[PDB]
Amino acid sequence: YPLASSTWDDLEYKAIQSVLDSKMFTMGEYVKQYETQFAKTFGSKYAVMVSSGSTANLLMIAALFFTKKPRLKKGDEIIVPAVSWSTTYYPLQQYGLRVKFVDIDINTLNIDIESLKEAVTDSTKAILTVNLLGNPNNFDEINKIIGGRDIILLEDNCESMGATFNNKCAGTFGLMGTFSSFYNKHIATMEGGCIVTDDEEIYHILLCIRAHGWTRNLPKKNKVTGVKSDDQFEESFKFVLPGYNVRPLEMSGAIGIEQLKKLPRFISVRRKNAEYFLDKFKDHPYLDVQQETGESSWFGFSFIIKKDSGVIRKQLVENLNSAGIECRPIVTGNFLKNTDVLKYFDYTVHNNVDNAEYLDKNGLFVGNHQIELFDEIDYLREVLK
Amino acid sequence: PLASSTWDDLEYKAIQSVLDSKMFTMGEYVKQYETQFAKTFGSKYAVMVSSGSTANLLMIAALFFTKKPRLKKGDEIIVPAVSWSTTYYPLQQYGLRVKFVDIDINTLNIDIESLKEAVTDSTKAILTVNLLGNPNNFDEINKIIGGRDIILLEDNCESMGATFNNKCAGTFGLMGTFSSFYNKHIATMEGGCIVTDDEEIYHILLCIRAHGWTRNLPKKNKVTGVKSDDQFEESFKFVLPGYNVRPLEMSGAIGIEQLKKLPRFISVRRKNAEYFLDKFKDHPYLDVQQETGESSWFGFSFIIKKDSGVIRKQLVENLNSAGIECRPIVTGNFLKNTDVLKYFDYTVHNNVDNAEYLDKNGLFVGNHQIELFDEIDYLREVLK
Ligand SMILES: O=C(O)CCC(=O)C(=O)O
Ligand SMILES: O=C(O)CCC(=O)C(=O)O
Numbered sequence: 001y002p003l004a005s006s007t008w009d010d011l012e013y014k015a016i017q018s019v020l021d022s023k024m025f026t027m028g029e030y031v032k033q034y035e036t037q038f039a040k041t042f043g044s045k046y047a048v049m050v051s052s053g054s055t056a057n058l059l060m061i062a063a064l065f066f067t068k069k070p071r072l073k074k075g076d077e078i079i080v081p082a083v084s085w086s087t088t089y090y091p092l093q094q095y096g097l098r099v100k101f102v103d104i105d106i107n108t109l110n111i112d113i114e115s116l117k118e119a120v121t122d123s124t125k126a127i128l129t130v131n132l133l134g135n136p137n138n139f140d141e142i143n144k145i146i147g148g149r150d151i152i153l154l155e156d157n158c159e160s161m162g163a164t165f166n167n168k169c170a171g172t173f174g175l176m177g178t179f180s181s182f183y184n185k186h187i188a189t190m191e192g193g194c195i196v197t198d199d200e201e202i203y204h205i206l207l208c209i210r211a212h213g214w215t216r217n218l219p220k221k222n223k224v225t226g227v228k229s230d231d232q233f234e235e236s237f238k239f240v241l242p243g244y245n246v247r248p249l250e251m252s253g254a255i256g257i258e259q260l261k262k263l264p265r266f267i268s269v270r271r272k273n274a275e276y277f278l279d280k281f282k283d284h285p286y287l288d289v290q291q292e293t294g295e296s297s298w299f300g301f302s303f304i305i306k307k308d309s310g311v312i313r314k315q316l317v318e319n320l321n322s323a324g325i326e327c328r329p330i331v332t333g334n335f336l337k338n339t340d341v342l343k344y345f346d347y348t349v350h351n352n353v354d355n356a357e358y359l360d361k362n363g364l365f366v367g368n369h370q371i372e373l374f375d376e377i378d379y380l381r382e383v384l385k
Numbered sequence: 386p387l388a389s390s391t392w393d394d395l396e397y398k399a400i401q402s403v404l405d406s407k408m409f410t411m412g413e414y415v416k417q418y419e420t421q422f423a424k425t426f427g428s429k430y431a432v433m434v435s436s437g438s439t440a441n442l443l444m445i446a447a448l449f450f451t452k453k454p455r456l457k458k459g460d461e462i463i464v465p466a467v468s469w470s471t472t473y474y475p476l477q478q479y480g481l482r483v484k485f486v487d488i489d490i491n492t493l494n495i496d497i498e499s500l501k502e503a504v505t506d507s508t509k510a511i512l513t514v515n516l517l518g519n520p521n522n523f524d525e526i527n528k529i530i531g532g533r534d535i536i537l538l539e540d541n542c543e544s545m546g547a548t549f550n551n552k553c554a555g556t557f558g559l560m561g562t563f564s565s566f567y568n569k570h571i572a573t574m575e576g577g578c579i580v581t582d583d584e585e586i587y588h589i590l591l592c593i594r595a596h597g598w599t600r601n602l603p604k605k606n607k608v609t610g611v612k613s614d615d616q617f618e619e620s621f622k623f624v625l626p627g628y629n630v631r632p633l634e635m636s637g638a639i640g641i642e643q644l645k646k647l648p649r650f651i652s653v654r655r656k657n658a659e660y661f662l663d664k665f666k667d668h669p670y671l672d673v674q675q676e677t678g679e680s681s682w683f684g685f686s687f688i689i690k691k692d693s694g695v696i697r698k699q700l701v702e703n704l705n706s707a708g709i710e711c712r713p714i715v716t717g718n719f720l721k722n723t724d725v726l727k728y729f730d731y732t733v734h735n736n737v738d739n740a741e742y743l744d745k746n747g748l749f750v751g752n753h754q755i756e757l758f759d760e761i762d763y764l765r766e767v768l769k
Contacts, residue, residue, distance in 0.1 A: 006407070013404065020397070023390065025574040026567055051435055054596070054629030086596045086623045093626050094478075183410055190409040190633055212438070212470050213725060225724075233701060237716045240724045242474040245438030249574055249633070317617060332621045340624045341597060 001325040003367040004184045015254040030253030042169040044196035046203040049248040053158040053180020054087035056193035060176045061091040066205045076125040081111040082356035084130045088156045099347035106355045107291035117145040119350035126152035131160035134297035136170045161186040162267040165294035187259035189252035209243035266370035273373045274298040280381045286311045298368045302330045305362035323383045334360035387710040387751040388568035399638040414637030426553040428580035430587040437542045437564025438471035439630040440577030444560045445475040462510040465495035466740035472540045482730045487737040491675035494521045503734040510536040515544035518683035520554040545570040546651045549678030571643035573636040597627025650754035657757045658682040664765045686714045689746035707767040718744035
């Protein structure tokens with residue numbers, strides 16, 4: 001039982017072969033297409049490909065500072081959840097925003113709705129939601145706590161590509177949504193990330209900031225510079241926004257196109273595996289599993305040691321490993337235990353983070369893949385007895 | 386054209402190898418490549434990252450995380466007025482105040498007499514850029530810093546392989562940055578490196594490159610001191626506000642190959658330049674670059690002589706219709722970029738008259754690792 005498995009076939013391999021014979025390796029044809037199908041795939045107007053889910057988060061944030069009428073500015077308050085990957089947080093700190101952490105809900109593993117409604121205020125300029133483990137946030141309920149102030153909605157959808165709510169694609173709820181194409185995820189392009197949006201102005205700020213803050217990937221009339229000059233001796237060396245060089249590589253673009261085709265069955269295998277998993281673990285003596293929302297893409301399986309259950313986490317761990325079972329902390333556990341990097345943040349905690357503290361000491365995680373795991377899952381129910 | 390393919394069958398083979406091992410995330414190849422890279426330019430340590438741009442990005446951020454921080458926001462760092470955009474963004478992104486310094490019209494590197502004046506009690510750092518393969522005269526810059534606590538940095542993206550005083554450009558500063566982007570000296574599709582002789586700096590980079598986690602860090606390290614054995618925990622701890630800027634295994638593998646070739650690329654580039662200089666030596670209206678130490682001859686700049694009476698624009702039209710692909714020297718005068726400068730906290734030491742001038746009567750055509758005698762002769766003729 002591995003936390004991970006390959007998602008490639010010969011198709012990806014000749015996809016690489018193909019980018020070779022072209023002898024055009026820098027972000028190009030492949031990307032553009034991948035970016036087109038990506039959007040077609042999840043129901044957005046615009047998608048943008050970058051070097052990683054991480055850089056996609058960097059860009060998602062940086063962007064809101066370059067809108068003609070800026071949407072964020074330093075010191076602004078943005079709310080986020082206590083549980084998520086490191087790079088969900090960094091950008092906030094890098095852009096000098098004031099972070100308000102909010103305890104997650106122990107059943108869904110996502111951000112606590114009651115806790116949220118009470119933490120959102122006048123100052124709250126944005127809400128950075130995170131779809132944890134394929135599980136989407138209940139967006140209807142988030143949209144009510146907001147309704148209908150001028151408060152930004154974004155989603156780090158890096159763990160839940162293919163998840164859905166009300167039959168709306170996760171990642172497509174935010175003003176911007178991010179995805180990650182890193183090895184261990186739903187699809188793998190070696191490294192890769194994607195930002196979608198339906199917002200024209202955001203779209204263009206992205207194009208610009210992903211590559212040097214120049215104008216070459218911008219259209220003749222754009223939402224940033226207005227009208228590009230025809231004199232390439234000048235228009236080609238014009239810098240309009242402090243960006244980065246976050247270009248994805250043609251190869252990833254080409255691999256992505258492919259992965260996007262296997263996606264559906266990828267997602268089918270996973271939900272059928274989860275179905276089963278839930279059956280086998282339904283009424284467990286000492287562990288709770290994730291409470292699903294919408295239709296999850298089931299990144300992995302989380303377990304949470306039942307309160308007053310006398311079981312000791314590092315005992316189960318031993319057991320699983322000794323049984324050839326790969327397991328790990330859910331995501332990264334309580335992000336707030338990271339006292340050191342925190343000293344660099346301008347953050348605060350709403351109420352408490354008791355749930356995350358509890359998930360930090362009592363939670364474990366085992367993977368889900370896009371190949372059947374009935375057997376293994378069967379073996380898992382035995383070890384955990 | 387202007388850019389050209391530095392690849393033979395070996396790099397293609399390297400790529401298979403990675404496919405074969407079926408391990409595409411920053412792993413062994415990167416590590417070998419970093420080891421070889423260090424030993425190659427004679428630096429203690431090396432770190433490889435996604436592009437040259439993320440190389441400079443990390444260089445700046447790194448100084449912010451040392452136990453005893455070398456830079457704090459609003460600190461003064463000096464830079465010359467001519468370079469590639471990503472040399473600047475990082476300072477802006479880091480909240481530093483930037484004092485621009487004019488280049489010297491001969492070397493195209495920062496003018497020393499101005500630096501001599503520009504440097505003050507508040508000046509905390511100095512970021513030099515070896516332009517077009519040309520190294521800066523470090524002897525006079527070190528002289529100028531004297532023995533003061535002033536950090537010297539290098540953006541060595543256009544001058545990989547050049548040398549000054551027998552020492553390798555990129556290795557004079559606390560840190561140095563290289564690019565292995567398509568059109569550069571070597572090419573790993575995309576990619577860059579950071580070199581340093583400082584261990585805590587080393588450790589910090591390994592940490593900021595990858596989620597500011599501890600994984601690429603040694604047991605006893607400069608950032609956390611001493612890692613624990615419980616990976617359940619250790620493997621999920623985060624200590625610095627880093628990024629995800631991991632280069633690709635495939636880019637690591639390609640680099641190593643590129644690395645053996647270099648020396649030769651370099652002889653051919655230098656070879657070409659030599660022919661070049663004899664050919665435009667006494668040009669009636671064109672000024673070329675004055676070499677310092679041993680340029681790696683990134684490409685060929687031309688600066689229209691004062692008085693000449695010749696228009697930059699016609700030189701272009703000409704080169705074009707002669708199918709010779711040309712461009713701006715680097716990006717020309719960076720300061721003309723008003724819209725972005727809006728986001729900076731900057732100042733201009735005196736004036737950048739030279740930058741101003743280069744921008745309008747300067748043009749560049751490239752240099753490649755294959756012998757170009759004939760093109761140069763046609764060049765001379767076209768630029769009659
Ligand atoms: O290391 C990465 O790029 C992805 C890390 C991640 O997503 C995870 O392990 O949760
Ligand atoms: O495309 C890039 O990465 C920028 C290349 C560069 O530095 C140049 O054109 O001078």
